[PDB]
Every structure is written in C-alpha cells, then in structure tokens.
Symmetry: C5
Subunit: 283 residues, 5 copies
C-alpha cells in the first residue's frame, strides 16, 4: 500500500507559519542550550568532563540540523494561490532530523554513562554496545522513513520501524542495566538524581516513534504539521531538560570528590542555591 | 471584519529605508549585547551564573532572529516603480519576532528570579509557572497575529490578544509576588536595585501590546513602519537596559558573599567606579 | 533642487574595482581590530573593562556592516557594456554605514569616558547626554542622506545636515567638558594620553561631514567612489587608531592602581616595551 | 579506455537521500570532534600541545570540507522525473575531499610524531619527509581521480594511483620507523598505546584506496553512493577514533611528566576513570 | 599594447579543477593557521603579545579573502561545452588577494619588529615607515594589476609595478636595518633565529612579483592557473612558515625574561621538545 510522504503535502498558510515557528523555535532553543553548555563547562571536574563533551555535541549537531531545516523550509515550498506547495527540497525539512538523531542518541547514551560507576571491559563493552544500538535504531528508522520506498511504502515503514524498535529495546536494556548496577555504588543523593534522569531519557525516547506512526497512518498538511510539532517539541524537551539533569549529577559528583579529597575544584559548586563544595587550590 | 496584515502593505522608499535601518540597528545592538555578556561573565560568582546564562540566551536568540529578518527583508520586497511591493517572504520580516520572544520572555523571567531569594519547592513552582505563562503569552499572541486568520481577522486578533493578556497578567503577578517576597531577605542596596529592575521589565512589557493594537486598528506602509520601529526600539531598550540591571545585582550579591566569607571571587568587583569586593584566593 | 543619490551613479570598471577594494579592506581591517580587542582584553583591570566592552562593540558592529556592504556591492551593480549599473540593492552599499555609526559613535563616547574621572549623577548625566547626542547626530544625518527625499533633495540634505551638526556640537562640548574636568584628577602621564586621544576622536569626526557635502554638491561615479574612499579610510583610521589609544590609557590606569595597591592584576602590564606593573596574586 | 566519473552518474531518490545523509552525518560528526578537541585542550601539557594543534586542524578543515560538499550536493543535482541528474557543480561533492586530505593526512603524521620520543635533526627530517610524502600521496591521487582525464581515464587513474601508492609506502615506512625507534624510550604504558594507535592510522589509510578502485572499475549511481559511504565512514572512524587515541597518549605522557617533576599541570588528569596525576601549582 | 587580464581566460576542466583545489587548499591551510595561533597564544608573554596579535590578523584576513575567492570562483565561471568561461565576477577570484596583502604585509612587518630590540622614537618611526611602505607596495600593485587599464595595459602594469618595486625596496631596507641594529642586543640564540626568520620573509616576498610578471607577459588558461598556483603556494608557505618562526622567537624571549626575573609565565615553555623556562607564580 502506497502512502504519501510528509514532505509531499501542500500546506495552508496557517500550517506553513506554524511549521516555520516550531523549526525556528527549536533551532533557537538549541542554540541557547549550546551557550549554556559552554558557559557552565567549568562547573564540572575533569573526571566528569565527558558529560560536557557529549552535551556540547548534542547541542551543536542539533542546532546545525535545525538551521539547515529552517533554510530548507524557506526554499522547499512555493506559495501558489493560498497553498504552499512542496518542491524537491521539501524532503530536507524532514530528513536532517535523522542526521541529528544519529549523533545525538549515541551521545545521550554516552552522557548518561559518563556519570555512572563503570570501568574496565564492562565500561567499554557497554559504551560500544549502547552507541552501536543507538546509531542503528536511528539508521534503520531513516531507511524506512526516507530511503526504502521514498517514504511512501507502508510495508517498508512497518518493517524498518520494527527493526528500529528492536534496537531501541536492546539499547534501553543495556543502559538500564548499567544504571541499575551503578546506583548501589553512588551516594544516595546522586543515585536518586541518576535514577530520575534515566526515566526522563527513556520516556523522552518514546515520543519519537509516535511521529513515525503518523507517517504510516495519516497524510496531509495537518499531519505534516503535527509531525513537525511533535518532533520539535520532543527535541526541545529532551535536549534541554535531560542535559541539565546530567550536568547537575556531574556537579554533585564533582563536589563529592572535592569533599572527599579525591580532587580539587577551582570554584565553589552551587546546586539549587546551596553550596556543595568550596573553591580550592593544589597544595 | 477583515484587515490587511502588516506584511501585505507596499512601502515607499522612505519606509523601506527606515525599516531596514531599524532592523539592522536592532540586530547590531543585540550583537553588541551578546559580546558584552561574554566579556563580563566573570564578574559574577557561580552562585548567580544563571543570570549570565539567561542573558546570553536572550542576546543570542534575539540576534539570530534579527539577522534572519534583515535577510528576509532584502528578499521579501521587490522595487516596482516607486514602491516596494511585498512578496510571499515578507511575513518573515514580522513572524520571527514571535520566535525570539518565545524564548526571551521566559529567559527574562529566569534572569529576574536568578537574583531573588527563593529556593525550595516554591522556587521551582515559581520558575515553572513563570516560564510557562511567559511562553503561552507569546504563543497565543503568535496565533492571533500570524496564524489564525493569517493576520487578517480582527476577531481572531482580539480573542487571541485577550488570551495573551491573561497570561501576561498571570506571569506578572507570579513574578511580582516573588520579588516582593525576596526584597525583605536582601540587603537594602540589592533590594532597591531589584525593585527598580522589576519595574523596568514590567513596564517594558507594556510597549509590545501596542504594536499588536496597531495591527488590529490600522493598515498601510506607515503602520507597518510604525510597528517595526516600536518593536525594534522596545527590543533594544529591554534587551540592553534590563540585562545590564540584573548583571549589576548579580555583581552586588557576589560581592556581598565575598565580604561575608560565603564565597571567594578571583577578581575585584567594581560597580559604578566603586570597589565592592577584593580579589581573593582559596586558602 | 534635485540631485542624484550616490547609489544611482553608474561606475566604470576602475571605480567598481576601487570601491570593492576599499570596502573589503575596511571590513578586513575591522575584523583584525576585533581580534586584537579580544586578544588584549586581559591587559586591562576590571575597573576599566568598559573600555574593552565599548571597543569590542565598535569592532563587531563595524565589521558586520562592512561584510553586509561588500555582499550588497556584489549584488547591487550589474555589468552592462563597460559600465556597472546600480540596481535597487545599490543603496545597501551606503545606508549600512549609518547603522554602524548609530552604534559606534555612542560607543566611542562611552569608551572615552570610561577612562576619565567622573562618577555619581554627573557621570550618568554625561554618559546619557553624550550617547543621546551621538545617536541623534547620526540618525538626523541618515534622514537627510537616505530617507527624506531619497537622498536626492538638496534642501533636505542641508536641513538635516544642519540639525546633525548641532547635535555634533552638543556631543563634542559635553565630551570635551568631561575630559577637561578629568585631566586635573589624573596622573600627568594619563592626563597627557587622554588629552591626545580626545583630539584624535574629535578630529576624526570632522572627516565624515565631508562625504555628506559631496553628496550635496557633486554626483557621478567618481564622486560615489570618493565618498566610499573617504568613509572607508576614516572608518579604518578612527576604529583602529582611537581604540588602540584608549586601551593604552586603560592599561596605564590599571598599572597605576596595581602600584598604588588599589587592585592586583594577574599579568604584568607592558606599554611601549616598558614594564608598568608586575603580575600579582591576592593575599 | 574511458569510464564515467562518479559525479556524472544520475542518482535514484534512494541514492540521493543516502548520500545526503552520509555527507551531513560526517560533517556533524566532525563538528562534534572539533568541539571535543577544544573542550579537552587543557588536559594536555604544553610539551605535547602539538597533538592538540594538529587535531584541531584536522577537525576544522574536515568540517569545512563536508559543509562545502553538503551545500554543493544540494546544488549539484536536479530532480528530473524520478532521477537526480548531476549538473556542473556535482564534481564539488567529490573533489573537496582531496583538499581535506591534503591537509589532514600530513597533520595526522604530525599528531602521531608529536607523542613519539624523537628530537634533533632526525625529528625535523622525519616530520618534513612525512608531511611531504603525505601531501604528495593525496595530490597525485587528486591528479588521477579529478584532473588528468577529468576522472574518466582508466590509464590516468592507474598511473597516478600507482604513484600515489608509492608515496603511501614511503610515508608509512618513515612513520613506522619513527614509532619503532620511540617505543623503547617510552614507558611501557605509553609504548603500548602508541603501538596500537599506529596500527589504527595505517589500517585506516588502507580503506581510502578502495574508493579509488571503485572509480576505476565501476560506474553508476550505486557506485557513486558506495564511494561516498565508504569515504564518509572512513572519515568518521579515522578522524574521531585516532584523534581520541593520541589525546590519551598525550595525557598519559603529561601525567608522567607531572609525577616525575618534569612539569606541573593545573588540573588532575583522568584516563578511563583513573586519576593519573594531581593538580599542582608552581612553587 | 593591450593584453588580456588573467580573469578573462577560459579554463579547461583540468585548469578549473586545479584552481579550485589550490584556492580551497589555501583557505583551509590558513584556517588551520588561525586555530594554531589561538591555541598557542598563551605560550608568549605579554611583552611580546604583538607577535600573536599581528599573526592572528594575518591568518583571519587571509582566510576570509580565500573563502571569498572560493565562492567567487564557483560563481565566476560557467561551464560551456568543455570550457569554463569567465563572467563578470571572475575578477573576484584575483582581486581579493590585494586586499589580503594590503593588511598582511604591514602586519608581517609589525610581527618581525615585535621581537626586535628597537624602542623609543626610532621604534615608532620604523613601524610607521614599514607599515606605510608595505601598504603602498601592495596598493600601487593593485592599481597596475586591477584598476588602471583594467589589468589589460602593459604600460600601466610596468609603470605601477616599478613603483611597487620601489616601495618594496624601501620597506625591505627599513626592516633589514632594524633587524641589523637589534641583533647585537639580543642573546645569541634569539639573534640567530631572528636573522633566519628575516631571510624567510624577504625571500618569500620575492615570489609574488613573479605572478605579476606573468600577467604582463603571458595570457591564457594555463597562465591564469600558474598565477593562482604560485600565489596560493606562496601564501601557504609565507603565512604558515614565517608565523611559526616569530612565535618561536617570542617564546624564546619570553623564557629568557622568566629566567632573568624580568617577568613570570604561568606555564612552562617548551621549544623543540626542550624546556626553556618553568611555570611560575607571582610572589
Ligand atoms: C556516529 C556517531 C557516534 C558518536 C560517538 C562518539 C564517541 C566518542 C564520545 C566521546 O569520547 C570520550 O570522550 C571523553 C572526553 O572527556 C574521554 O574521556 C576521557 O577524558 C575525560 C576528561 O575529559 C576523563 O575524565 C575520562 O576518564 C577519560 O576517559 C573518553 O575517553 C572518550 O571515549
Ligand atoms: C519554551 C522555551 C523556554 C526556555 C527556558 C529555558 C531555560 C530553563 C532552564 C534554566 O536553566 C538553569 O540554568 C542554570 C545555570 O546556571 C542552573 O542553575 C544551576 O547552576 C548555577 C550555576 O553554577 C548555580 O548557581 C545554581 O545554584 C544551579 O541551580 C539551573 O538549575 C537551570 O534550571
Ligand atoms: C543605540 C545604541 C547605543 C548603545 C549604547 C550602549 C550603552 C551601554 C553600554 C555600556 O554599558 C556599561 O557597560 C559597562 C561594562 O563594563 C558597565 O560598567 C560596570 O562594569 C565594569 C566592569 O565590567 C566596572 O568597572 C564599572 O565600574 C561598572 O559600572 C556599565 O555599568 C554599563 O553602563
Ligand atoms: C600542505 C599542508 C601541510 C600542513 C603542515 C603544517 C605543519 C606545521 C604545523 C605544526 O607546527 C608545529 O606546531 C607546534 C605547535 O605546538 C610547534 O611546537 C612547539 O610548540 C609546542 C607547544 O605548543 C612545544 O611543545 C614544542 O616543543 C615546540 O616545538 C612546532 O614547532 C611546529 O613545527
Ligand atoms: C591598511 C591597514 C594596515 C594596518 C596595520 C596594523 C596597524 C598597526 C597595529 C599595531 O597594533 C599594536 O598592537 C600591540 C598589541 O599588543 C600594541 O602593543 C602594546 O601591547 C603589548 C601587549 O599586548 C605590549 O607588549 C606592548 O609593549 C604595547 O606597546 C601596540 O601598541 C599596537 O601598536
Ligand atoms: C535528541 C533526539 C532524540 C533523543 C531522538 C530519539 C529518537 C528515537 C528514540 C527514535 C526511535 C524510532 C523508533 C524506535 C522506531 C522507528 C522510528 C524511530 C527512528 C523514530
Ligand atoms: C525582549 C522581548 C520582550 C520582552 C517581548 C515582550 C512581549 C510581550 C510582553 C508581548 C505581549 C503581548 C500581549 C500581552 C498581548 C498582545 C500580544 C502580545 C504577544 C504582543
Ligand atoms: C567609527 C564611526 C564614526 C566615528 C563616525 C562618525 C560620523 C560622524 C561624526 C557624522 C557626522 C555628520 C554630521 C556632523 C553632519 C551630517 C552628516 C553626518 C551624519 C556624517
Ligand atoms: C582523514 C583522512 C585520511 C586519513 C585520508 C587518507 C587518504 C589516503 C590514505 C589516500 C590514499 C590513496 C592512495 C594510496 C592511492 C590513490 C588514491 C588515494 C589518494 C585515495
Ligand atoms: C602573505 C602575503 C604576502 C607576504 C604578500 C606579498 C606581496 C608582495 C611582496 C608583492 C609585491 C609586488 C611587487 C614588488 C611589484 C608589483 C606587484 C606586487 C604587488 C605583487
């Protein structure tokens, strides 16, 4: 059964204006997130700098992706009558999300594990498996949604969506097992924060398949609009909310190292207005 | 009753030149503001770094928005005879302000509360309510002014403007109550500065509805010009003036922490040519 | 009496090539100036950081303006025969200077006063008056040269030029009075440098009205070329020369504070190969 | 015997979408790599800063190259029927890789030798030979693949490929001999890491000739797609994997200098979650 | 006698591909150089920061120039048959080098004198003369090669080339005399490095007139190609090689100041793998 792809639908003026807003809102929010990451990078010790590196990468690639999509949007539809009619570049308002996710979901996995308590073979095993799984979930998604059948084949979307779902399950299990093993080896305060942060990333992941199901089941300007609103909103919530959460844990673990004498930090660490550690200098 | 949207009016050469100037002036002013924020970020302690983060975000998003609009302006009107006639891109000289405001008004709320005395559940309750309220005021504004009716429906502008006004009131009350609760718990010097800063943000907010009322009541090149001049000028005044004001309070509270022994700061803090605290090092 | 605006003249290949060179030379020089400002920002104490902020802003806004103009130049003339014929974008090779000046002349005023000895009501009174005066001089200039009459009305150029000249006089007097009051309260070395720097900014200002007089009196490709050469050259000389000069005074006043025990500085300060203060640390 | 160049093939929608994805994925990955390099630059002592400089250069040049290629891709094919047909810009989706490699392979050579134990005339001799050899391998490759015969001559591809292969062998031998001489003069831990890193760069180099052989042997959209996938994937693996590996060795050698008293480092160095050296200050 | 300018020649596919490569190679190399300058700026004391400022400027202006030229190249030729035929933008693939040189040759002069031992009136006299001479050599070159006669007049090229040659001689003599006077007042190690560096800049300068002589004597695609290859290659060699050389001298003079007690430096200075000074702190 053939369906029409999301980038094939003509848009009303309302829909065209809504999509522009959500794309530009997301790009802007992500650029704020990038700046936040840069400005707060010194709050975290060198032992937990991977958290900052991972988050910087998420914010940079996501920003670039949305900037590309906003420009593609301006060039991918032509006003004809009262409708905006998609040209051959309209696909570049949807496909670049798959590029973003191909990097960002693996980097999220790395960010989450950066503040967990794993080392040795297990650490490397877990990080590789989780990165690989995360990449494959997005890539198989991209094949169904964009490449095989040109986004128009229900069978292709279903098959590749199911494959993507398997990699989702695998990655999730690998990450959840890692966190579960770490929580006993963390301080109560960190353990609690890490558990909460883990629910937010997994739960945030469940929103994205919903846009894929729309592509399978419904076509039209309203549905294209819905896809962009759902994915823009998920991108904002996941890439500001979650990133803030790991930063807090990295700060807390830094401060615990300072108080334990494991390391020193050049500035005081404040979390929710409360001082967690004092500024210090090497002897 | 149908009206014509602001981006539908033909412009005289004078009007076209004035709008270009104001858009480019605002973009430039905001880019200066961004640089100022970056250069002065080390004047504030880690306890008050949210002020800098919030302000950086305002300046980055606003700058991008105006750069986009200046480019849209160059492509959204065609010189025909002695008039500049808007094409289908002219709406991108108005609509991106709603993107900017959708981030900046929530970030202003965060900036103001960053230097207040809250913490606890109330802090999170207040920050979320104020962010949500602020976002909804702009978004409902965007629906009336751009989306529902295509900016041409008086009824839609009135209804959505009224809804936006309710969210304005709510956000204002939430913020004013927070400040009022904080002022007794601040030092007199900070309390006085914080009260003044609060009047400037609320008062600055009242200018923006005036451009919305123009869209409702008057159409033509002169009115489009007026809208852009009012909104550009408000953007400049609010995003340079207010941001400077919170930075001063964050500096003053930093210096008070240094003198109280609550924290140390790597450089001396100067405010209006007077030294507030000395440079210090961890023991 | 009608005249032709500068952006209306056809250019010979020689003139077109000269203008490109001067615009690109100025943009490049200003981008160097920006980099210089960033690289030398730590040579100045926090008490005089406004000098660096002001100068950063001048360099960023001026650079952006010239980059815009160089791109506008490439799109605002079409090679037809042996002539370059201006299209409707040619005005964007002249008008953006008014945007630049609208920010830069106020920021110059702020830079000059940043190293003077004023505080209290007078300080704020002077800074506001000088900023306001400076902005109005440029804005009234822009109205005569670009907006009212489309740059083609001699009467409009004369009237608005005279108004701009009044604001020039006012701003100059306000600044000169401030400097004159400061010089007795500075050390001889700084006083001497500040007096010299003040003559360079005022004298540099007198070049700009000459380009305005050309617009009034002469039209043609040679005159358009002359306007661009004069304004490009003035921009280079004023925005590299003067900025260097205030930086030196800020360095000298920093070093005098270090030697007086008023503050400490993390590095040694060198001025013209001679060490002015040693690197120090907080007790 | 004439063949068709890779940029001459028409692409199906699937192929066009795959190439876009891989180009954008590589550009994004490399931009992450650049950010990583900048954020982790302070983990390495000044004695080994060449490693960071070399790696920064690889990441900046590669990113720029891919950004250029992604934009070229959007302009170098036109949708005609169900095919994307290459225009005269399509060659700019292949040729810029040769620019990237012309800098990056010499910089990789420099990065590898940056952490080796070699100095004096031999050091300069080795660095020059390896840089020269590396540059010539790419340049002779570019001549066969792009310039002589316009990418369409089998004889030219074979001859210039063979020449490029000779320079490959020479560069490899020079580098391997340098590493082999260094390994005895390093600590066991560093020696082991350096040996591993050396295999990864040489092995990574062997992938690239495979894309050249495709150009010789097979033409069509599938083959163009294959070339881009292989080269994008190799670029990602070599420019994220190898660069991480030298950074670790530079960190380890830094930490060994700190523990030996040869130098001090401002922060603690952590490698795989284990502390290698403490933060220190000059006496 | 009329000749054809370099930007008037049609290019074969081979020539077009070679020029693209060299322009993109140079832009990329210079962007690496910029990054190198930024990453190594803290290796030099404040007494010698002019070296870093000068070099930063060379690298920023040169990079921008080549980026402009690469984009101009993509738009300045049209594929027609088997030839690339220049349009009216092709001149922007040659003329921007004159902009770059107009800043970079004066900045090279400043860089060389930054590490010499001249000071007082002589210092300012020398720096002004050398900057002025350097600027005039390039500007008179630009007049002959681009402006007067449109690059087509042999007489104009000869006359203005001769004038440019006089300014070359003057600038060279001024610089050589300064170095010669400095060498006795430097330590042997620095004196030797400074003498070598001086030969490299003067010798590097002699390559550029050769491209000018081609323009006079030969016209065609091969000659245009030759001009771009010679000038690109000279730009790479002069703006990476020489800049590295002054940085080393600035590092060595910094280290000598540290060992003499003239100043302190925050990190150790390493030159060719050997430690020259230890990291220190203010007493
Ligand atoms: C296709 C897209 C796939 C994307 C995958 C990206 C993989 C790389 C992720 C980052 O890679 C990771 O970076 C951090 C950077 O701190 C390094 O971590 C290292 O440095 C930090 C300090 O900075 C130390 O605290 C840490 O103990 C040490 O192992 C890791 O050794 C490296 O593996
Ligand atoms: C729709 C668009 C709405 C956009 C809103 C986006 C902003 C919301 C999040 C604000 O981001 C806010 O950043 C500051 C960064 O200093 C964090 O604050 C944290 O770090 C600072 C700085 O060390 C500490 O002083 C502070 O005590 C600690 O709580 C907040 O915990 C986080 O909530
Ligand atoms: C239309 C366009 C007009 C543009 C005009 C812009 C005017 C404001 C720009 C300068 O604004 C000025 O910034 C400096 C930044 O150091 C602040 O100055 C403050 O911080 C510095 C340190 O950084 C202290 O030494 C100083 O004592 C303190 O007052 C001023 O309080 C603020 O008023
Ligand atoms: C065609 C394209 C080819 C590109 C090749 C470019 C080669 C030059 C780039 C590397 O150039 C190299 O930079 C490092 C930068 O640290 C310098 O290295 C110098 O500084 C570092 C500190 O930064 C010291 O630890 C080192 O001992 C010292 O020699 C080298 O002296 C220089 O030769
Ligand atoms: C056509 C346009 C060509 C323009 C060429 C450039 C013009 C000359 C620019 C020279 O800019 C030069 O910058 C350095 C920056 O360190 C300043 O130098 C000053 O600061 C440094 C520290 O930073 C001190 O070591 C030095 O003793 C002091 O004089 C010079 O005083 C200034 O003259
Ligand atoms: C910041 C971006 C994030 C976290 C993106 C997440 C995306 C997914 C979790 C996607 C999952 C999918 C499936 C499980 C089924 C097929 C469709 C996908 C790719 C959307
Ligand atoms: C820096 C940007 C700021 C502070 C923008 C503020 C915008 C508003 C306060 C807008 C308010 C509106 C209403 C209250 C009703 C009419 C619609 C709006 C959105 C203009
Ligand atoms: C860096 C830019 C500077 C210092 C620009 C200065 C511009 C002026 C001083 C302009 C003055 C003018 C008049 C006094 C008369 C009318 C025309 C003006 C605007 C050029
Ligand atoms: C990061 C980029 C890298 C490491 C690129 C490497 C490229 C090569 C090793 C290319 C080698 C080639 C040959 C040995 C034969 C001819 C074709 C070449 C240029 C691909
Ligand atoms: C980094 C750029 C450099 C060092 C450029 C140097 C250019 C010259 C030395 C040019 C000299 C010329 C003459 C002496 C004769 C006329 C032609 C010129 C301008 C190329």
């Amino acid at each position: 059964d053939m369906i029409s792809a999301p980038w094939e639908a003509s848009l009303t003026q309302a829909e065209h204006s809504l999509i522009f807003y959500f794309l530009a809102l997301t790009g802007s929010a992500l650029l704020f997130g990038l700046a936040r990451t840069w400005l707060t990078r010194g709050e975290v010790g060198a032992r937990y700098r991977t958290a900052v590196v991972a988050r910087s990468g998420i914010m940079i690639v996501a920003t670039l992706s949305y900037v590309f999509m906003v420009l593609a949007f301006t060039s991918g539809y032509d006003h004809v009558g009262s409708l905006w009619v998609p040209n051959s570049e309209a696909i570049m308002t949807i496909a670049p999300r798959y590029v973003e996710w191909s990097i960002a979901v693996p980097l999220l996995s790395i960010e989450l594990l950066s503040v967990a308590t794993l080392s040795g073979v297990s650490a490397r095993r877990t990080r590789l498996a989780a990165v690989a799984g995360a990449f494959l979930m997005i890539f198989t998604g991209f094949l169904g949604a964009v490449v095989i059948g040109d986004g128009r084949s229900v069978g292709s979307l279903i098959i590749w969506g199911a494959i993507s779902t398997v990699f989702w399950i695998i990655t999730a299990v690998i990450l959840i097992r890692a966190i579960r093993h770490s929580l006993p080896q963390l301080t109560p305060e960190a353990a609690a924060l890490l558990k909460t942060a883990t629910i937010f990333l997994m739960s945030g992941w469940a929103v994205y398949p919903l846009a894929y199901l729309i592509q399978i089941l419904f076509a039209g300007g309203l549905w294209t609009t819905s896809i962009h609103i759902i994915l823009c909103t998920a991108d904002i919530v996941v890439k500001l909310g979650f990133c803030g959460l790991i930063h807090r844990i990295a700060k807390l673990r830094t401060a615990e190292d300072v108080r334990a004498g494991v390391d020193i930090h050049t500035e005081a660490i404040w979390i929710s207005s409360v001082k967690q550690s004092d500024a210090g200098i090497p002897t």
